Amino acid sequence: LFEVAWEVANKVGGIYTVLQTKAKVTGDEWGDNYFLVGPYTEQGVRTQVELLEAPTPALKRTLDSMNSKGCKVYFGRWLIEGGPLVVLLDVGASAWALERWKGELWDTCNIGVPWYDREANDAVLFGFLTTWFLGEFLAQSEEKPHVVAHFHEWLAGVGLCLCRARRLPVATIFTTHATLLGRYLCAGAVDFYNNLENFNVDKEAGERQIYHRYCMERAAAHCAHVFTTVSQITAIEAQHLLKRKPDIVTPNGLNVKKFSAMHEFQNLHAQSKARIQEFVRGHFYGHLDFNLDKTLYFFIAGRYEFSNKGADVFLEALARLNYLLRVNGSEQTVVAFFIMPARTNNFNVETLKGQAVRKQLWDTANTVKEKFGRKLYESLLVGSLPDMNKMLDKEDFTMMKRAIFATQRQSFPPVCTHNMLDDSSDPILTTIRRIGLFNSSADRVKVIFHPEFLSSTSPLLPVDYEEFVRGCHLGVFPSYYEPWGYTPAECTVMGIPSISTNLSGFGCFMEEHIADPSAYGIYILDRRFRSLDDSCSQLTSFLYSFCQQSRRQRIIQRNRTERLSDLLDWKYLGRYYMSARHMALSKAFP
Amino acid sequence: LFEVAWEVANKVGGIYTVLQTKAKVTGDEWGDNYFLVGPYTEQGVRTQVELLEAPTPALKRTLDSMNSKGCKVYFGRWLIEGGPLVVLLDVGASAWALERWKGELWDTCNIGVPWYDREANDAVLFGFLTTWFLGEFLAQSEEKPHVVAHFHEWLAGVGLCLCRARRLPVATIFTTHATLLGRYLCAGAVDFYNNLENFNVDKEAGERQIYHRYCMERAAAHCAHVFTTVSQITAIEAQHLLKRKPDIVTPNGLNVKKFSAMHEFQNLHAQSKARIQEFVRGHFYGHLDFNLDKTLYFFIAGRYEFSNKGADVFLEALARLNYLLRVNGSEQTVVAFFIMPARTNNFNVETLKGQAVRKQLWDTANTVKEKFGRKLYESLLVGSLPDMNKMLDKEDFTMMKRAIFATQRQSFPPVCTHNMLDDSSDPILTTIRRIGLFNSSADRVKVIFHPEFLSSTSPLLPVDYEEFVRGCHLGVFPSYYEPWGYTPAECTVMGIPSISTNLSGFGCFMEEHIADPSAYGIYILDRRFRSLDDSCSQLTSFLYSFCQQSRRQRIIQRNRTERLSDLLDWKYLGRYYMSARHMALSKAFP
């Protein structure tokens, strides 16, 4: 098996997660005949990969057959023990002969990549290197086994045509997880779901680009022995646009972390929410005028797509929910996070300063705490109950007064934790300042935009993504166009209720698998049969309905949402890959 | 309402718990017309009671009507906010005229108490004082209301005859929670449950005593307007021995502590089990040759009755389970606690020394821990990953070696944490040394006898009873004769599976309230239709079956057992007291 892809060592939301979750089961069920191919980027990928430059059995012949011939191929383990013997390929090591590879592409399939975008050039170069490695392996192994080559996305789709030109006896499977042409039309301010058969692919390809990419994608789909897509909705645009109906639907699964107790995810949520509460206390210093027990943490994560990931409708719903909470005289407050990576330069002074003063207050309270504890210990040793007024003197009251005065703040807490280099052109900040949300005292919702992926080694918010998601209360992902949707998937795996859409692969998958959804925390939101304003109103209604329920109802809802983890497990969802491999073997050679 | 009883301020297992749990609901449903009467003992009862010597409304007339007349009456709150206005009565303050009270008893009902036992003399004196207080209150209040007087046990049963002699217009309810004659015959090595109608009460009363007590109990039962008992099994011996069928059965409830989350009792169990693990590490120092993750904590609590609370059968079952675990080659180990108060003098040196060396090892590990943390912090500040061998020098290895040598122990850990003044006559230690259980390395079960009630301010085991019970895994109470049974009741309230009996009020109550018991953690054990050896074999089978199930099964079983807390709630079980009060009002005056 060869699961060649571009995201194996570099962290990107797509491809990387599905491969990392699949590797364990796909290796334990099959064995050491599982091989993974990907690129090399000088970004720290070697930190997570245990490279094996020295010769190693289980395809030891290529190391002394081709490595010392002007190429660069490594063998790694990934630090994940699913037996993922990964074949890492360097991109910049072999780039001096791009002209001959372009000529080879011209001879074979009249395709290639223009010099405008280096991403696709690197993808094609990696495809050439992968094809050379696979051919060398077949030559060295005397063609005794019939290996199956599987391809993900267009970043590794040139392998299909390269192998078909050379007629290598392998079973070809191609699985596209996102028709990028659909992605770039859905961002073109044009309706995409009302009609699909009225699109002219060649006319649209090129004004927004995606002409060579579309051509190579369709060539791979046609020439691949087995074609596959993520959701049933994915197959719909695949057969209507690429004119190649997928052989079988292959829903995306996850490696659920089973605990010895059913309620351990609740404890993880409690701890992570405590950490988020510490961050909130840091950010809203001098403005802690709202109860923190009535605070709910909403969030929308993923790549920074405004109209595709559904951030405009979420912000409109947040403004409306703020208006209803203000006019209803409610003590509930909602802190909404926005984890969408936009380029910054560093943090702003306000956020780091807020964390600093929060922990300075923590230190001052600690000091008074040890002094009080020592005096109380003396009193208990003597045998007299404290009268509570003889312990604290004038100096510690003086320093508490000084600390309180130092934390006084007149400006409002910032909406962005980082210092972005383009604030006049950022959609999120623009609409935030348009809808009049500035974390004010009167505001019932507080927006925090964290334009960066979460990491466990960050100066502020020392939580990785999974822990932070476990800490939140509701994940709102009203995405207009996205094939499957991972973020709601692990939200429901970790027990957090989520707001999906009927235009999403996750929402569609959970639509017909459960009778009466939204009773299990899956607030499916209709975006196909409703206008934008109606969808915003429905999102506001869903948010308010989540707000009105008490703590017991929230706990019960989280339990019900967690109970659905078995649907997205790779044990249940891995059978489709096995079926695809069986069809590929039957088509190529029994 | 007057709930007069002997255990209101002094801590005894019976009476005290039921009154303390009932007070909240019986005061919130009725109001400030609820009055509680009890004795005064110079044992610290005033620490838990906020006495009000100064005049206070809501029966302010007695304070300036009778208190300054040679008596001693206080008003208290109990520190429990169920509105329990308690009328505390001093016992030793008014004891100079016992002869006239004895003559009054002779004139009224030919009863009294012989000078052999001072407990019953104090009870009768308290009854006289209570009757005087009630009569003075009626005189001062102009008899406007028709108050209801309720009596518990024979320690407050002279009030019935004293009030009937004076014909005070009150509604009399008497509730006996234990027919003491049954208790003392069941300890006389004679069968009690095979027949009940063949007993001669007068012949049996006096050789074991309980003649005056039996006479006054039956006089109270006959003269009381409403008679009541704890369980249905209680009414059975009440009508067959006292010849006064109770008007209605009144099962004993509990004030369940509801948490905002369903699983919080699991977290409490985890924390309490961690504390018990610390105690076990202290006790078994130099002998930690068994995995602590495979350790299950069984316990049997309550008053020190050997054949009545079922301690002999539990120890036989423990020995048998040890034999099966040894011959089965099992890694599971079981630590069985015995909380039965027997008089001691202090702790023994071994147990305190064991706790001391445990925490000395904790301190040594802590010291090495700070040194390692500082060196690691230096390494991380520099920027170099530790090589793990340059940090620890020779001195800290030297002190770890010295600490390890100091904790070496050749004698086995003791079975009793305290130093009892009669070890040659203690039934528990006698049978423990007979069945050959000495906490050896080969022994799969380890017995710890803690001859004292648990307290939160003890030098070792700083846990109160409820926390310790939450920490255990299974409460075994194979009691032969006991009317209702509180310990399994709060074991099931707090989620711990329990082993009750069909001769118990709790076991009988749960028998016909749930279809197919032992599926909810209620291991009902038959002791009526089975011999002693067969009962021991069934207990051994139950213990082994509990041992074989894994952690997930234990968690599920605890959840199921916790789900039954609503059956024993005072909300559901308090209706019988309301019915009894209604019948008393109907019988006395509508």
Ligand SMILES: O=c1ccn([C@@H]2O[C@H](COP(=O)(O)OP(=O)(O)O)[C@@H](O)[C@H]2O)c(=O)[nH]1
């Ligand atoms: O702060 C973040 C936000 C998102 N993700 C990852 O990004 C993926 C989102 O994938 P999705 O299919 O939702 O959309 P994509 O971002 O791939 O377009 C999830 O798997 C997350 O694990 C992350 O690692 N850190």
Ligand SMILES: O=c1ccn([C@@H]2O[C@H](COP(=O)(O)OP(=O)(O)O)[C@@H](O)[C@H]2O)c(=O)[nH]1
């Ligand atoms: O270490 C202990 C052991 C027992 N109990 C109390 O003793 C009572 C046991 O009552 P039960 O009806 O089981 O028997 P009794 O001891 O009254 O005969 C329970 O309510 C416990 O709260 C306690 O407070 N501490």
Ligand SMILES: O=P(O)(O)OC[C@@H]1O[C@@H](O)[C@H](O)[C@H](O)[C@H]1O
């Ligand atoms: O954050 P909330 O919705 O109020 O949930 C409250 C918390 O949920 C879970 O983490 C646990 O059950 C906690 O014990 C509980 O306090």
Ligand SMILES: O=P(O)(O)OC[C@@H]1O[C@@H](O)[C@H](O)[C@H](O)[C@H]1O
């Ligand atoms: O002591 P056990 O029977 O092994 O139960 C194990 C513990 O039970 C509960 O206290 C919690 O669920 C803990 O998370 C779990 O570790």
Ligand SMILES: OC[C@H]1O[C@H](O)[C@H](O)[C@@H](O)[C@@H]1O
């Ligand atoms: O469909 C699988 C997932 O990965 C894809 O590459 C897309 O980035 C994402 O939106 C999709 O949900």
Ligand SMILES: OC[C@H]1O[C@H](O)[C@H](O)[C@@H](O)[C@@H]1O
């Ligand atoms: O019946 C109520 C409870 O209190 C009684 O006084 C007994 O001490 C106890 O065994 C009984 O279970």
